[PDB]
Amino acid sequence: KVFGRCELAAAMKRHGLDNYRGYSLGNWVCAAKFESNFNTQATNRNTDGSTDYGILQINSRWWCNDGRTPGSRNLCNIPCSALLSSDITASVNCAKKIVSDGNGMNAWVAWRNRCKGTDVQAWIRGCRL
Numbered sequence: 001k002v003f004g005r006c007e008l009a010a011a012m013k014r015h016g017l018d019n020y021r022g023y024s025l026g027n028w029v030c031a032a033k034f035e036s037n038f039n040t041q042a043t044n045r046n047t048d049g050s051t052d053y054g055i056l057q058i059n060s061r062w063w064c065n066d067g068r069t070p071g072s073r074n075l076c077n078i079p080c081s082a083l084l085s086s087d088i089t090a091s092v093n094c095a096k097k098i099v100s101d102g103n104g105m106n107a108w109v110a111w112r113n114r115c116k117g118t119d120v121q122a123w124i125r126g127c128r129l
């Protein structure tokens with residue numbers, strides 16, 4: 001599923017991401033924009049053999065199991081395929097664990113390079129929330 005911007009903001013807010021760990025909703029929408037272009041089916045292979053999955057590009061090195069990342073962890077205790085469903089509950093719940101482990105949203109390379117320090121509020125402007 002390719003979400004619309006305001007559609008994704010509404011689903012993230014419904015699942016309790018707005019201001020989760022102090023990150024306003026515009027940060028989460030922005031990160032999803034640049035990690036996946038709002039596409040729940042996005043995947044990207046990393047140079048170390050791991051893979052990033054879903055609308056927030058969560059990495060199999062630590063957070064999910066895909067059966068093909070030797071020596072990796074599954075800290076969110078989910079198959080990585082659960083991060084590709086049109087329902088973002090799995091992605092949101094895993095994002096809550098990731099963003100809580102001490103480094104905040106810097107865990108998302110696209111957020112750090114393209115959202116951090118910008119006017120992230122623009123990404124939820126105009127949305128009825």
Ligand SMILES: CC(=O)N[C@@H]1[C@@H](O)[C@H](O)[C@@H](CO)O[C@@H]1O
Pocket residue numbers: 044046052056057058059063098107108109110
């Ligand atoms: C929280 C998380 O899994 N972030 C990943 C990161 O691990 C990976 O290096 C990158 C690849 O482009 O995409 C995402 O930012």
Ligand SMILES: [Cl-]
Pocket residue numbers: 024025026027120121124
């Ligand atoms: Cl915001």
Ligand SMILES: [Cl-]
Pocket residue numbers: 065066067068069070071072
């Ligand atoms: Cl594995």
Ligand SMILES: [Cl-]
Pocket residue numbers: 011086087088089
């Ligand atoms: Cl949803």
Ligand SMILES: [Cl-]
Pocket residue numbers: 021022103104105
């Ligand atoms: Cl933080």
Ligand code: NA
Pocket residue numbers: 060061062063064065066069072073074
């Ligand atoms: Na894994």
